[PDB]
Design a protein around this ligand. Sequence first.
Ligand SMILES: COC(=O)NC1(C(=O)N[C@@H](Cc2ccccc2)[C@@H](O)C[C@H](Cc2ccccc2)NC(=O)O[C@H]2CO[C@H]3OCC[C@H]32)CCCC1
Lengths: 99, 99
Amino acid sequence: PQITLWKRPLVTIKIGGQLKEALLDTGADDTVLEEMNLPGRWKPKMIGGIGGFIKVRQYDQILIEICGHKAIGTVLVGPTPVNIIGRNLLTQIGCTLNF
Amino acid sequence: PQITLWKRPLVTIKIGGQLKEALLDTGADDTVLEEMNLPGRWKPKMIGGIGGFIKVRQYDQILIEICGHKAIGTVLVGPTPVNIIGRNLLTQIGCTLNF
Ligand SMILES: COC(=O)NC1(C(=O)N[C@@H](Cc2ccccc2)[C@@H](O)C[C@H](Cc2ccccc2)NC(=O)O[C@H]2CO[C@H]3OCC[C@H]32)CCCC1
């Protein structure tokens, strides 16, 4: 589909058996989700944004369904205020900016 | 044009007569540029992203050309790590997400 930018581009995602709302963010290198208890191993990471850095847990080869489009990649989990879908997964669903 | 997301969607912008590189950022409500001298009046403001808040100077009704498309809107200037073009200007140049 096509998503205008009058409002935040929030869509429904499915991860780890749960439905969530997430922001399609062309300005995010990585996908960063609000605190959730995913199974398996992880590695610590620090990611920077406007204002500074936050600590997150890096999970690899995680499946996420974004508006029915599946993507498999790295998912970071930590104290983010909004679920963010980043370019690592947006590329996999064929997402483009168009003007 | 159509922009894929395998790389950061960086474009050349012109503001205050000066060229700069900036990030097309669907995850930003607002446009935030690195410290620079802009003509006209400004008001102090604060904006919060990942990591915390930063102090910015808000310039309203500023001419800015983004990848050949002209916009006139609010620009925030402050210690941002990257020049980011947010949805307030992305809507003016007719930008949408598509997948
Ligand atoms: C390298 O990849 C990343 O940096 N990605 C992260 C990231 O911060 N990216 C930035 C762009 C960015 C920032 C700094 C350096 C390079 C690129 C935005 O794309 C996403 C945030 C999300 C957010 C919404 C609400 C509240 C807090 C946070 N938007 C944001 O700060 O916007 C500002 C400006 O407008 C305002 O609206 C929203 C808040 C205001 C870092 C980790 C994950 C995301």
